[PDB]
Design a binder for this molecule. Structure first.
Ligand SMILES: Nc1nc2c(ncn2[C@@H]2O[C@H](COP(=O)(O)OP(=O)(O)O)[C@@H](O)[C@H]2O)c(=O)[nH]1
Ligand SMILES: [Mg+2]
Length: 326
């Protein structure tokens, strides 16, 4: 519920908002980055000050990658209030979604490795500790990896079919999970007809993921593979070219994280932003999906926001669930 001040470029503004709300922050104020970052505080001094003194702000979030000296300084000027850069932001998101100890360990590891430098710039006892913890985590992860190869695909069952909602950020993953579970988190079981179905708002596909935290991301996302079905959300407001990119990228990642032979209901979302190109885009998405993956359960136009084609969606989801109930 924490309130946040977002600093971002116009280019990635709608990107950051979606991600910040993903991280359970209320974006109370946004600020455009200044092109040339402050040598001390990265952002603007005056703007940093207003934030220092605005009691309505628990957290300062900067959708860029700050260097150690930036954190050091911004932290000084913001005693008590937390500052997140892009790395820490995504990491907080992963934490909100990671259920597996392995994924949790990847996140801890990366956070430690991200603090290590900030602390190293400047205590020895702390450094020594970070080192010892980083090593322990790697050994833990290393032994999990070994366990996996020396074990068989267990993959427990579930009382209720669980359907993970996947897709790029700002595609509408959350909006859809919300309208489907009539809320306003993470996992929720909903009754469609005489059958109950577990829904999961999954961690999305994420653009420009920094090297530091790719492992954390991959493992977090891979948890989706233990779903019975997946609803792939897609932003209909993309031009055909970008639309092709998204589809290509989506199924690339899905094959990457080991999704196979899993029914996928593709939803083309945001159709209330009508440009007159529905049919065109809908046929494009459907053809290309078929070409890239199987089994494609169905491809359907929707508006998570306006709830325009909700009944049919619930029908497809029901039919899908019924299909998986045996
Ligand atoms: N017009 C329209 N906007 C939508 C729709 N679904 C989501 N949005 C908006 O798109 C932005 C991203 O939504 P979000 O659920 O956070 O996307 P996510 O990052 O994939 O989970 C939000 O600000 C929504 O209000 C839709 O069906 N129609
Ligand atoms: Mg989200």
């Amino acid at each position: 519920m924490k309130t946040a001040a977002l600093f971002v470029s116009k280019e990635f503004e709608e990107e950051a908002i979606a991600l910040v709300e993903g991280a359970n922050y209320k974006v109370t104020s946004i600020y455009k980055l200044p092109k040339s970052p402050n040598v001390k505080f990265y952002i603007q001094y005056d703007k940093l000050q207003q934030i220092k003194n605005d009691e309505e702000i628990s957290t300062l979030i900067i959708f860029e990658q700050l260097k150690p000296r930036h954190f050091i300084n911004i932290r000084r000027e913001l005693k008590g209030k937390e500052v997140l850069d892009k790395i820490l932001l995504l990491l907080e998101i992963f934490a909100l979604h990671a259920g597996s100890k392995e994924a949790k360990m990847q996140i801890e590891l990366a956070r430690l490795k991200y603090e290590l430098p900030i602390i190293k710039e400047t205590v020895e006892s702390t450094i020594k500790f970070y080192k010892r913890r980083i090593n322990k985590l790697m050994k833990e992860l290393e032994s999990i990896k070994i366990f996996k190869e020396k074990s068989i695909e267990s993959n427990k069952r579930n009382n209720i079919p669980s359907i993970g909602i996947v897709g790029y950020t700002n595609s509408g993953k959350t909006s859809l999970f919300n309208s489907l579970t009539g809320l306003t988190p993470k996992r929720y079981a909903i009754p469609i007809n005489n059958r109950k179905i577990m829904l999961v708002d999954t961690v999305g596909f994420i653009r420009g993921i920094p090297p530091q935290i790719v492992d954390a991301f991959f493992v977090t996302l891979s948890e989706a593979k233990y779903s019975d079905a997946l609803i792939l959300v897609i932003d209909s407001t993309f031009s055909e070219n970008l639309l092709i990119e998204t589809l290509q990228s989506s199924f690339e990642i899905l094959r990457e994280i080991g999704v196979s032979g899993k029914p996928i209901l593709v939803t083309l979302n945001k159709i209330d932003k009508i440009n007159g190109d529905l049919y065109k885009k809908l046929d494009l998405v459907e053809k290309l999906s078929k070409e890239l993956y199987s089994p494609i359960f169905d491809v359907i136009p929707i508006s998570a926001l306006k709830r325009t084609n909700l009944e049919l969606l619930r029908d497809k989801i029901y039919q899908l669930a019924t299909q998986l109930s045996l």
